[PDB]
Amino acid sequence: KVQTDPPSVPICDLYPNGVFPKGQECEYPPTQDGRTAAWRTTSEEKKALDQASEEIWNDFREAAEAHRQVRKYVMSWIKPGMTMIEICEKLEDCSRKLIKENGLNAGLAFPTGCSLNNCAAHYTPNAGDTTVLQYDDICKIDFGTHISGRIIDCAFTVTFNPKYDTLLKAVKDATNTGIKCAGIDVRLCDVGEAIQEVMESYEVEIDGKTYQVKPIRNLNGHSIGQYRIHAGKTVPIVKATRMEEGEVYAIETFGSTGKGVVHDDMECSHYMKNFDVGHVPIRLPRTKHLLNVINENFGTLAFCRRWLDRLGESKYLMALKNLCDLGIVDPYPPLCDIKGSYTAQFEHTILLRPTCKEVVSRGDDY
Numbered sequence: 001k002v003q004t005d006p007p008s009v010p011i012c013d014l015y016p017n018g019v020f021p022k023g024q025e026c027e028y029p030p031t032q033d034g035r036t037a038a039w040r041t042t043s044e045e046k047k048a049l050d051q052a053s054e055e056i057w058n059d060f061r062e063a064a065e066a067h068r069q070v071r072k073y074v075m076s077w078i079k080p081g082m083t084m085i086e087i088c089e090k091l092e093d094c095s096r097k098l099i100k101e102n103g104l105n106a107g108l109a110f111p112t113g114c115s116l117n118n119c120a121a122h123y124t125p126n127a128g129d130t131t132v133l134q135y136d137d138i139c140k141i142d143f144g145t146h147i148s149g150r151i152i153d154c155a156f157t158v159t160f161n162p163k164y165d166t167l168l169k170a171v172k173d174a175t176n177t178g179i180k181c182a183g184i185d186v187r188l189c190d191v192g193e194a195i196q197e198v199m200e201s202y203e204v205e206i207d208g209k210t211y212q213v214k215p216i217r218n219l220n221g222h223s224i225g226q227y228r229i230h231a232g233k234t235v236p237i238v239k240a241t242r243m244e245e246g247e248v249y250a251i252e253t254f255g256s257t258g259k260g261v262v263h264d265d266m267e268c269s270h271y272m273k274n275f276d277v278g279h280v281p282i283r284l285p286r287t288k289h290l291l292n293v294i295n296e297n298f299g300t301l302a303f304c305r306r307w308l309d310r311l312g313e314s315k316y317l318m319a320l321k322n323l324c325d326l327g328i329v330d331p332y333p334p335l336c337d338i339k340g341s342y343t344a345q346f347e348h349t350i351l352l353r354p355t356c357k358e359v360v361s362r363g364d365d366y
């Protein structure tokens with residue numbers, strides 16, 4: 001069984017024995033003392049501890065192969081003139097097929113981010129959004145897949161105008177730097193300091209104006225847990241907590257021509273149940289029904305309004321506002337720098353395995 005063009009064959013059909021391709025395997029970086037952490041690659045104890053969790057790494061790998069094939073497909077057709085809704089639906093239809101969507105066991109980890117220009121993250125169109133992708137737009141495609149709650153958080157920036165090329169190169173270099181510096185027992189702030197140094201070494205010229213690339217300081221990389229996009233540890237992208245063995249990280253960087261700070265803007269599209277909130281009894285009928293729809297379809301995974309619409313739900317905005325006011329659900333509005341600024345993003349999911357560092361979402365693209 002081989003993949004079609006357009007992709008339609010599920011990843012688990014292409015690998016029937018359930019053994020999926022590994023990502024990029026890296027030896028851990030040397031410590032601040034100078035001594036190499038290379039011993040882990042050949043440690044018999046570490047090898048045994050690594051093989052014990054093979055099923056887990058294997059679920060990330062299936063989700064990462066779906067991610068690579070979905071993004072390669074998106075790159076072949078994404079063009080100015082298409083509406084943001086058309087782009088997100090065409091991407092998500094392919095993603096649902098390749099991951100072989102099956103309730104909470106396999107599916108979409110979070111909505112398709114397609115944030116534009118000064119907006120860096122957490123924009124996906126709601127119903128009725130007539131926004132059209134423009135030739136001069138700088139679009140961040142950030143989408144997620146999962147197998148048994150093992151999440152792939154991976155993102156790239158789309159442009160059609162070469163004026164943004166050095167901005168894209170700066171952010172890609174900063175993300176790859178963050179990835180290289182990551183390792184077991186490495187301080188989170190040391191990863192952030194390395195990201196910042198590389199990012200700010202770039203100067204770009206866009207429409208006769210020059211800027212020194214700034215990392216967005218209130219946007220950061222993070223640890224990932226099962227069914228938990230942000231597991232509590234923060235990887236800053238600027239200058240005490242260490243990365244630990246068996247942890248999973250989203251290493252992401254955002255470069256900006258603006259202030260290098262984002263603020264909540266536009267209408268909200270992204271929502272997610274507070275992971276720590278237990279069962280809450282609700283009697284309000286529309287609010288109770290909506291929370292049941294959320295628990296059944298998303299659990300602790302992120303969702304968007306378009307995903308409620310496709311489930312045949314209507315008249316839910318007040319119900320959704322009630323769940324947000326009660327603190328059961330949290331809204332995640334678009335995060336934007338100043339008007340007229342330009343933002344870029346690159347992101348990979350990395351597995352801190354006992355034997356090596358695996359850039360599980362790495363592809364031949366980025």
Ligand SMILES: COc1cccc(-c2c(C(N)=O)[nH]c3ccc(Cl)cc23)c1
Nearest residue numbers: 110111222229230270271272302303332
């Ligand atoms: C405590 O939960 C958090 C905190 C900060 C950011 C996120 C988050 C990220 C992320 N950390 O990359 N991606 C998302 C996609 C959709 C939605 Cl609704 C949320 C998020 C989650």
Ligand SMILES: [Mn+2]
Nearest residue numbers: 142153154155
């Ligand atoms: Mn992301």
Ligand SMILES: [Mn+2]
Nearest residue numbers: 153250252347
């Ligand atoms: Mn992320």
